């Protein structure tokens, strides 16, 4: 699309200093070529030019005192990218690398992911360059309070609902919510998601991402007249998402055989399929040791230090941990192993070279993270619904809706790709389904945003 | 009722310059005689005197620029008549004839209609003397933005929820909502109803009015130990309501045999009962040609120019289009044809002379529009519920509730009429059921409003 | 001006049912012909078409209980006509005749009067058809509370500042303010003017109108190389404005020789120039007897029952009481007496026939009320300034500013009339000066309002 | 100061991509060394680290339609840098070069300038990459409305008061204010400064900057036991500031002899000291021709194309136009001419190399722009005071306060420099006086911001 090509060129030039953002825009816009070409009306209202600019960006100062009385200063961000279809929504990330470029990229992607869920949720991302590592509980609390003391004025249950991300878990959410309720003088607990149950959190929230990624894979087996049962899976991390996946895989007849750590990776040809095995992952996570070895020590299974599990022969690869985990180097090993299923779970766990490469492979199935990991945002939307109804749903209710929607995200993505003649391209399909709803909404709302 | 008679006399005199409003009050209050007489307490708190005065009236200036850069000025209205039982609710009408008199009349009636639904909905009406005919899409957009830039401050999801009416459809709602969200800085999509699905609209909303009018007729057959099946129906228009009715009639064993236009009317003894036939109506509507002839041309069926279909012999008459469509002249032809069922669907499609006349006829069944067309406001209440829960209901869910409530509106109306000894007077029955809930609510709330 | 002529024709037709409003627009717009013709740019932005439509109109229900427990229902109004140059400002009128037509007319005129003061004050008018006659203090209080319980949400110190008018004096202002502060939970006493001193009222407020009308007449003598001293004046009423005028006239070397009542009028060739004489007027006002006779009884001066003092030969005529007091019948007597000075003080105390007539008279000086009575709104602006500074000015300060501005209003009016070649036409001059500031402000603010 | 040195090093590294901002911080912080060293307590509360981070940054999307119906998208900014001593305050700049770096730099400097005025004014800056060149009046209006539709929620008379800057003059302010009042539903005219008189603008506002820069120079003559009279001045531009300066210089016994344009510069050994001469500048400005030649054509004075007037021998140099106008190349010519007075008027009209150079010159007097051009922000504070009092001050009042404060800014700056042993260093002196008030305020307010 000449139109699409022009917008990418303008972005590349204007936001040169925001490499992460530029790359994401190109990657996403480049798959919409066919859709845009079918809708000349978009260009007439500068639809794409509007979409690439967040509705609202807020950055603010965050001074806070440590346990020693020393004063520190960090910077807070909230990028409210697109709210055409619901209140803005997206996690908060606390990591020393956070800057505007990164917030925009995660926030642009969030809008597309949120649109796929089929729930009314806009897209946003925020956080701070604050580093929670080595801070006391009390220091994290004071930071969260100082952070919320400015943020509260920009968010709210019908405005912008933040959630957890790297560096922000239940604990940080609890502290931020405590400050919020005190300043605003009311409950409004739907202002954040990822809450503890005692004050409005949803059942299945910890399992959401991992389970949802398996319900998606299941929809893939079905499409391919295949089956999870018997299937072996290579996982990354031993974290929340890894834990949730292993668990549902096990329950489903499949088994993970690997886990990974910054220290290396383990192989467990038996499968991390036991209550004992599975629960221990929570142990390791708890420990705060940060060693995947502990699992091999404990179970007496192979531990290959400083090594990625991407070399093992398995039926399904699911990177559940870090960005750019799979590089060309890892993709080639994956390819050489004749794995048909490549399923991104963690956010951007594959470099673009690696991605194109895997996508060029005619026999493979490559699923993008924005669709596969949608189960977590899906449970965040269910928590907001529960908080608005002022009641709790049962775990069977949440899990059953989770399951039906994950299947729909896969199926709709395939259908969309197919319709624009792209074949079974789950990557473009996700982008397209996500884009269409947003475009419909913006076209109907006129030129205001 | 001397009390009722006195209030009507005061209205007639004070609002002499608002003929439309005066007539509506008389017509409605005059049927409550029996109820009021049973509740002396009403008069002690000047219940009727309060009811006839809207809680709040807002009129405002609306300057806007056309595509040529010329500046135009129209007037905006919102009459918030009664909010005893829910947020005010009612459509917006854009037509050069709009003035306060007309807003008050539609708004007084809206309060009674909304009360019948059994949902928590107050009554209001608004609009502008702006004429959307001959305006570009862009001109309508700029007008909607200018209109909302003042209106937003008077409405809100828990305050006043506007909806479509003459001159205001999905397109205008979309543009007004776009401006609203931008000014308020949040989502709050329950602020308007009749929205597109992409941003919160409900399934069955387009079909709501027409379908609901048929579920009501069905409750009438049942009362009269009769049946829809086999029944033939004379419709008016080829619009949304006509389309929805034909459709559900067909599905139900009945058939419409007429349609109408400003150009005349058509007769199709076969019935507009085919997918082809039915869907074409949407075609004609789309065309923007405004000719019922196109249907006869297309299907090769009779077209009688400049003629109302009220002369054809059918089992059921359903005027689905314009006010004062049926006059004495048309009622006599209807009477002479021995039609037992007279069912108003469009708003005030019968003149009062014609109405009294039909009502004097001992063998007929006359149903008032405020009850029969309640399916549209009913779906607006379901959309508000869905937006508050932050989810969508399925089409089966909406349709099933629609159906049960429409039956209840008929049944409750008959029961009420019967209890005050009025026989099967669906017209007074609607007024009475509507009035009672409102009165209960106002009596309990005291003298504040 | 063809443009001016067209707008008047459109008004006449659209607001046919609002005779009072139509007449005022014609009278005002017709004098701007020359100014409009000098500014073609006005028509390009539909300046006049916008001006004739109030920015915002609010009407609301007002139920209240009397001392006997009976419930009454009145209607409340606030027409916020033009706020281009300041918060809306204008009195509240409680009289059974009040309707929208009358509010619009007084409110359109208010905008022009407020603009002349040179202070930042927009124009508005409001009130109720509530009749304070025969009500107890307690009944007036309950009404004022019920009235404010809705009004508070539409006004505020930086939004709309109401003041007294017919039927609304210090007492009503006090009660409305009491309810306002209680609902809003703060002080904000600049929300109303005409307050008692104990809670923010300004010194000279009772004298403001009457005194200001004399400082204006003084500027007229100066223009005409004449003098107040020796001058005799015919007044109307024995009220606040009459009292203030007599007082300042006396102090200035002049003397009033008449007063009037619904019962007739008195002649006091000595002059109502004594402390005794002057103060008694307050007595009569207090009495609540409503008889100008009491003054003649008391002083043994002529009392001509059922007669207007417009037949007495005096140097200056100042109608200080009621609308359309001076008709053609009275103008002819005035003319026949060779009075050169005709100075409207009360609001619209002259019919239009009478007005044109007096204006056709080559030797006379006719001053319009909107300029002459501006001293009262001027003191309302000074009260708002004092309340914003949170202090009180001395009486010398208020009186001295009052005086300088009244002179300026006369002088600017003459200068303006002169510049458009109209001669010493104080009537058109007022309209023109008032219009120009408003037009400047609207042109600079764009097409929003 | 090791502390100061450390903060600069951190800034340089963290904001590498914001060169303009980095340079400004270094330049300002490096002169505070002596003050910081005297207050160890600052470092204990991370005072400098907090100061270099704006309290709040807002960026937002700005879609707007041109006269042809085409849709454009720009980006809006508001950097609310420091509000310790008053509502944030600072101009809006519309220029295609605008980005966050530039907003931060102008906004950091604004905080120091505003602090010097002695009025309660914080510091901020905002704008858009929108280019007003070649736009119609109507296009600028639509942009201003779209811009304000988001901005209004972040500003307000007690929060953030924007003012004009490059690309934003009375016209843009008028349009933005029009939209603001319409959305907020009240007056609050103190929300912006630089307004037209009709709606609250202050007398002397157009003359403020230029006049104030001359009252400062006068305080310099006094310090140096010298005199303006007889003095000759080289100006840059023929704009507002140049016009105001020439005017007051003339009146004071001095004379400008040069003016400049993008086309070259003119020399008028007589002096641009005549009503005719002076007023023509307004002519040239009006013309929109953008040619300083027109002055030479008109007066028959020398015009040296493509040349800066920095080579002429005069007593005083006052660059009143563009950034980095004076480079090393121009400073050397200035130096070689033995000019003692170097007075920056325009914002950053000298490069840093040039600055250091001039500052190394033992016989010269170099005055920084942040102090010299403070007269414009000073009149903005007086306009806010007038709008809060709801009255206007006379021109003599504004001018007299302007004058006394400008003298004080010079005198306090010298006194401060002197106290920290820096001699007559007006550049460091400005920084120091500005910094001290801000530091006092932040130390007293604690660690919140």
From Swiss-Prot, chains A, B, C, D:
Residues engaged in binding substrate: 89, 110, 113, 164, 380
CDD domains with a match to the protein in the record: NAD_bind_2_Glu_DH (cd05313)
GO BP terms, alphabetized: amino acid metabolic process; glutamate biosynthetic process; glutamate catabolic process via 2-hydroxyglutarate
Keyword list, A-Z: NAD, Oxidoreductase
Family designation: Belongs to the Glu/Leu/Phe/Val dehydrogenases family.
Subunit structure: Homohexamer.
Name this protein carries in UniProt: NAD-specific glutamate dehydrogenase
């Amino acid at each position: 699309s000449k139109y699409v090509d022009r917008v990418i060129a303008e972005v590349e030039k204007k936001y040169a200093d925001e490499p992460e953002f530029v790359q994401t825009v190109e990657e996403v816009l480049s798959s919409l070529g066919p859709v845009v070409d079918a809708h000349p009306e978009y260009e007439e209202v500068a639809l794409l030019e509007r979409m690439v600019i967040p509705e609202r960006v807020i950055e603010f100062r965050v001074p806070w005192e440590d346990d020693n009385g020393k004063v520190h200063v960090n910077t807070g961000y909230r990028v409210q990218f697109n709210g055409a279809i619901g209140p803005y929504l997206g996690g908060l990330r606390f990591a020393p690398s956070v800057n505007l470029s990164i917030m925009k990229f995660l926030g642009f992607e969030q809008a597309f992911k949120d649109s796929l869920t089929t729930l009314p949720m806009g897209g946003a991302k925020g956080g701070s360059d604050f580093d929670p590592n080595g801070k006391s509980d009390r220091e994290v609390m004071r930071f969260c309070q100082a952070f919320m003391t400015e943020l509260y004025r920009h968010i709210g249950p019908d405005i912008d609902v933040p959630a957890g991300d790297l560096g922000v878990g239940a604990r940080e959410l609890g502290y931020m919510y405590g400050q919020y309720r005190k300043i605003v003088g009311g409950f409004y607990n739907g202002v954040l998601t990822g809450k503890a149950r005692s004050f409005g959190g949803s059942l299945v929230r910890p399992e959401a991402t991992g389970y949802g990624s398996v319900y998606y894979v299941e929809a893939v087996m079905k499409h391919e007249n295949d089956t999870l049962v018997g299937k072996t899976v290579a996982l990354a991390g031993f974290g929340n998402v890894a834990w949730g996946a292993a668990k549902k895989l096990a329950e489903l007849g499949a088994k993970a055989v690997t886990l990974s750590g910054p220290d290396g990776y383990i192989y467990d040809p038996e499968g991390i399929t036991t209550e004992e095995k599975i629960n221990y992952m929570l142990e390791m996570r708890a420990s705060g040791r940060n060693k995947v070895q502990d699992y091999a020590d404990k179970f007496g299974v192979q531990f290959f230090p400083g090594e990625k599990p991407w070399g093992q022969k398995v039926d399904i690869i699911m990177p559940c941990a870090t960005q750019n985990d799979v590089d060309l180097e890892q993709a080639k090993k994956i390819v050489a192993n004749n794995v048909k299923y490549y399923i991104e779970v963690a956010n951007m766990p594959t470099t673009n070279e690696a991605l194109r490469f895997l996508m060029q492979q005619p026999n493979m199935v490559v699923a993008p993270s924005k669709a596969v990991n949608a189960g977590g945002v899906l449970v965040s939307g269910f928590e907001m619904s529960q908080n608005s109804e002022r009641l709790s749903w049962t775990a069977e209710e949440v899990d059953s809706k989770l399951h039906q929607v994950m299947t729909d995200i896969h199926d709709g993505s395939a259908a969309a790709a197919e319709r624009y003649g792209l074949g079974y391209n789950l990557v473009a399909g996700a982008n397209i389904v996500g884009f269409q709803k947003i475009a419909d909404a913006m076209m109907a709302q006129g030129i205001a945003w």
